[PDB]
Design an enzyme around this catalytic site. Structure first.
Site, short mmCIF file in Angstrom:
data_model
loop_
_atom_site.label_atom_id
_atom_site.label_comp_id
_atom_site.label_asym_id
_atom_site.label_seq_id
_atom_site.Cartn_x
_atom_site.Cartn_y
_atom_site.Cartn_z
CG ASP A 1 -6.36 5.49 -4.85
OD1 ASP A 1 -6.43 5.96 -6.00
OD2 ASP A 1 -7.02 4.50 -4.48
CD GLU B 1 -3.10 -0.76 -0.23
OE1 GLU B 1 -3.03 0.35 -0.87
OE2 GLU B 1 -3.99 -1.58 -0.46
C1 LIG Z 1 10.79 1.47 -2.90
C2 LIG Z 1 9.85 2.51 -3.42
O1 LIG Z 1 9.51 3.43 -2.70
N1 LIG Z 1 9.41 2.36 -4.65
C3 LIG Z 1 8.49 3.34 -5.20
C4 LIG Z 1 7.31 2.60 -5.85
O2 LIG Z 1 6.65 1.87 -4.86
C5 LIG Z 1 6.39 3.61 -6.50
O3 LIG Z 1 5.44 2.88 -7.23
C6 LIG Z 1 4.10 3.13 -6.75
O4 LIG Z 1 3.94 2.58 -5.42
C7 LIG Z 1 2.74 2.90 -4.79
C8 LIG Z 1 2.71 2.09 -3.46
O5 LIG Z 1 2.82 0.68 -3.70
C9 LIG Z 1 1.56 2.46 -5.65
O6 LIG Z 1 0.46 3.16 -5.12
C10 LIG Z 1 -0.45 2.38 -4.32
O7 LIG Z 1 -1.25 1.50 -5.16
C11 LIG Z 1 -2.12 0.69 -4.35
C12 LIG Z 1 -2.82 -0.36 -5.26
O8 LIG Z 1 -1.87 -1.26 -5.76
C13 LIG Z 1 -3.19 1.59 -3.74
O9 LIG Z 1 -4.14 0.77 -3.07
C14 LIG Z 1 -2.53 2.59 -2.80
O10 LIG Z 1 -3.53 3.53 -2.35
C15 LIG Z 1 -1.39 3.34 -3.54
N2 LIG Z 1 -0.67 4.21 -2.57
C16 LIG Z 1 -0.42 5.47 -2.94
C17 LIG Z 1 0.55 6.21 -2.07
O11 LIG Z 1 -0.91 5.99 -3.94
C18 LIG Z 1 1.67 2.87 -7.10
O12 LIG Z 1 0.61 2.26 -7.78
C19 LIG Z 1 3.05 2.58 -7.71
N3 LIG Z 1 3.14 3.19 -9.07
C20 LIG Z 1 3.27 2.37 -10.13
C21 LIG Z 1 3.23 3.00 -11.50
O13 LIG Z 1 3.45 1.14 -10.01
C22 LIG Z 1 7.27 4.45 -7.48
C23 LIG Z 1 6.39 5.52 -8.09
O14 LIG Z 1 5.54 4.79 -8.93
O15 LIG Z 1 8.37 5.09 -6.82
C24 LIG Z 1 9.25 4.16 -6.26
O16 LIG Z 1 10.38 4.75 -5.62
#
Ligand SMILES: CC(=O)N[C@@H]1[C@@H](O)[C@H](O[C@@H]2O[C@H](CO)[C@@H](O[C@@H]3O[C@H](CO)[C@@H](O)[C@H](O)[C@H]3NC(C)=O)[C@H](O)[C@H]2NC(C)=O)[C@@H](CO)O[C@H]1O
Ligand SMILES: CC(=O)N[C@@H]1[C@@H](O)[C@H](O[C@@H]2O[C@H](CO)[C@@H](O)[C@H](O)[C@H]2NC(C)=O)[C@@H](CO)O[C@H]1O
Length: 185
Positions: free
Chosen positions: A86, A69
């Site tokens: 989100d 998450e």
């Molecule tokens: C190690 C690190 O920090 N990596 C970062 C990646 O994790 C990040 O990818 C995005 O991560 C977030 C959290 O997992 C994803 O958002 C979440 O999505 C879930 C559903 O799967 C949702 O229920 C949550 O509410 C939501 N949280 C937030 C904070 O929005 C997001 O989908 C990932 N993006 C993609 C395209 O996969 C990337 C940025 O993408 O940065 C890395 O450093």
């Protein structure tokens, strides 16, 4: 509540796996992403333990949801205000969706983890009523899928993740949970 070690999983999709700059996908990618968050996860140990005891949910499952998450706070500690995702609907370590639940506690609080874990339990109850003859492992995976997409968009066990973020939410969360079970944090 079903046994997480017996849930089948294909892990993370390539899309999910890409965002950690991994050259491979699937369960190994889930393991790696879980391992990445394990250090941050230590901070919340007392809370994850307390809540897992209260709900009778494996702490590895809680931890896996925190990882998926918000990366154990890595991607939400610096929004304004802190703890949001989100746009701007997901609150806290476990991303409680404000549209459906009033988000309680600080973003990184025991109160927040308690809430979100209670939400998961409610989905376990909903999926057991919806598919009472799925195995309890199928049910637990459906509940995890519902935590992301609603019990209304969990139609079958084979397509359990088809309507989830990344089309892999329960697959990934299950694999990360399996890592945390095996390795600890
Ligand atoms: C190690 C690190 O920090 N990596 C970062 C990646 O994790 C990040 O990818 C995005 O991560 C977030 C959290 O997992 C994803 O958002 C979440 O999505 C879930 C559903 O799967 C949702 O229920 C949550 O509410 C939501 N949280 C937030 C904070 O929005 C997001 O989908 C990932 N993006 C993609 C395209 O996969 C990337 C940025 O993408 O940065 C890395 O450093
Ligand atoms: C962690 C979280 O907040 N998960 C969200 C789900 O609750 C939500 O699904 C909705 O859950 C409510 C149960 O509390 C239901 O009233 C509602 O029926 C249900 N939605 C559906 C489509 O079945 C989903 C919705 O996509 O979002 C999650 O973020």
């Amino acid at each position: 509540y079903g046994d997480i070690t017996q849930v089948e999983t294909s892990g993370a999709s390539s899309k999910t796996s890409r965002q950690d700059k991994l050259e491979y996908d699937g369960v190994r990618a889930s393991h790696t992403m879980a391992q990445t968050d394990a250090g941050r996860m230590e901070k919340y140990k007392s809370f994850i333990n307390n809540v897992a005891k209260k709900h009778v949910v494996d702490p590895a499952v809680i931890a896996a949801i925190i990882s998926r998450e918000s990366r154990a706070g890595n991607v939400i500690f610096n929004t304004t205000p802190p703890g949001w995702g989100d746009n701007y609907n997901g609150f806290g370590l476990m991303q409680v969706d404000k549209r459906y639940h009033e988000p309680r506690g600080a973003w990184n609080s025991e109160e927040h983890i308690d809430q979100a874990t209670g939400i998961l339990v409610n989905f376990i109850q909903l999926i057991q009523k919806k598919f009472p003859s799925w195995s309890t492992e199928q049910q637990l995976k459906g509940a995890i899928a519902a935590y992301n997409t609603g019990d209304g968009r969990v139609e079958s066990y084979e397509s359990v993740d088809s309507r989830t973020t990344g089309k892999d939410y329960s697959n990934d969360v299950v694999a990360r949970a399996q890592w945390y079970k095996k390795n600890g944090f």
